[PDB]
């Protein structure tokens, strides 16, 4: 199995134009759950989530999300008071875990104020890393509750991973599939005497792809331009890499290596 991850995001907006609160869950790049302050309901985002979780899951987490929504509103008000900020500001949260290919795990829990790092949980020392003195004030208050830190460590290391394993089974046909890339090299004289080489890949799943340009099989070419890995809209992805010009494009995707000699 490849590396997989589970994560839950929260967005809180003060004085919005836009919901006051949104929560979205993901398995890798796939949305799995959604909640907002308008619907006040937690709903599946993936048919394999809807098909496999009974209504009591959605009923229970809707109640929790309504409480988390209220807690987010109060916490953003306290942050604004600490910073002496008026107007519309954002509060964000990300919690999740990763199950690596080798069986080892990672877990993370972070907060952001106005889209910047604010508090970073360290589950190995059971402490919060504060970026400034407002975050330090919150860190001191939160660390006073040792039970909650321990609870968060247990959730990140044990509960999150068990949810991830459960969801990966539910979404097996989507998440554990391989759609190999369609790769081509395009050559063109651009500015006189200048040749541009593009290595373009599309139709692949998962989105994680490695592409590079090599010279005489050995050295990586200096000054490679990389294209972002973009969703094609049909569940597959596209990307590219280019160079100015014996050159070859090297592509690695889900245990398969590919060379396109120019």
């Amino acid at each position, epitope marked *: 199995m490849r590396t997989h991850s589970l994560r839950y995001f929260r967005l809180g907006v003060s004085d919005p134009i836009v919901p006051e609160f949104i929560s979205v869950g993901y398995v890798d790049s796939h949305p799995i759950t959604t909640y907002d302050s308008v619907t006040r309901q937690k709903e599946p985002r993936a048919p394999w989530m809807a098909e496999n979780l009974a209504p*009591d*899951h959605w*009923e*229970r*987490y809707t*109640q*929790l999300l*309504r*409480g988390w*929504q*209220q*807690m987010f509103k109060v916490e953003l008000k306290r942050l604004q008071r600490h910073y002496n900020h008026s107007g519309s500001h954002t509060y964000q949260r990300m919690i999740g875990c990763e199950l690596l290919e080798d069986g080892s795990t990672t877990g993370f829990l972070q907060y952001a104020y106005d889209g910047q790092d604010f508090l970073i949980f360290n589950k190995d020392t059971l402490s919060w890393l504060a970026v400034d003195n407002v975050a330090h004030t919150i860190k001191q208050a939160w660390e006073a*509750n040792q*039970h*909650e830190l*321990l*609870y*968060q*460590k*247990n*959730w990140l290391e*044990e*509960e999150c991973i*068990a*949810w991830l394993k459960r969801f990966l089974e539910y979404g097996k046909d989507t998440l554990q599939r391989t759609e190999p890339p369609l790769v081509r090299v395009n050559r063109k004289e651009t500015f006189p005497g200048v040749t541009a080489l593009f290595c373009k890949a599309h139709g692949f799943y998962p989105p994680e792809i490695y592409m590079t340009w090599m010279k005489n099989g050995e050295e990586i070419v200096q000054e490679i331009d990389y294209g972002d890995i973009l969703p094609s809209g049909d569940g597959t992805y596209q990307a590219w890499a280019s160079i100015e010009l014996l050159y070859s494009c090297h592509v690695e995707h889900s245990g398969v290596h590919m060379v396109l000699q120019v």
Partner: antibody
Amino acid sequence: QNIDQPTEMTATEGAIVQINCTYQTSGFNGLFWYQQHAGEAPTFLSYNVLDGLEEKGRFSSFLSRSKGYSYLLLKELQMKDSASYLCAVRDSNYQLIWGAGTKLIIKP
Amino acid sequence: GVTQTPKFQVLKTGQSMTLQCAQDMNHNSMYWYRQDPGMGLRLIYYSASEGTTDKGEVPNGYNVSRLNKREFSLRLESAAPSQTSVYFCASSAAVEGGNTIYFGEGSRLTVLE
């Protein structure tokens, strides 16, 4: 989903009693121990979520997550320790599942 | 802590009853439990925060109102002899892990034909 603790336990004054709690839940988000005197409200004793033994005076709370087991250990037993001891486990959906309780009887 | 009333109540089958509960700990979550011999506390209704309530394990014959952040009342619409029990109101800072539950003194209710 089940939480199991003995119905009743009897020990002698000045001795030690270990009250076991086993749980079969889909997930685990912590284990509580409460003390409830006859005709009184339950009162908090401990919360365990990671592995180990936590000592609070004459009372200790142990947890083994892999074994799905906890115990409440009461040392130097006094008559005032005669009460029911309730364990509760928070499951994967944060539902608190309460055990039926253990009535502890102290023989003077 | 948690203040609940009344401590004792005798009701006739079919009568209405409201159990009051308040907490001064600025807690978000509130609960109503019933305690019956030989079984664990059973959740009737809970309120994860102000502005929301939901059914517990034994909601039938009851209803609740989260009046404000402090208050959570339990209503017996048409009391039945099976509703003879000890009722405990409870509160915690949040429903999530670790947060200590605080119980009220308990309400002993007896429903008679």
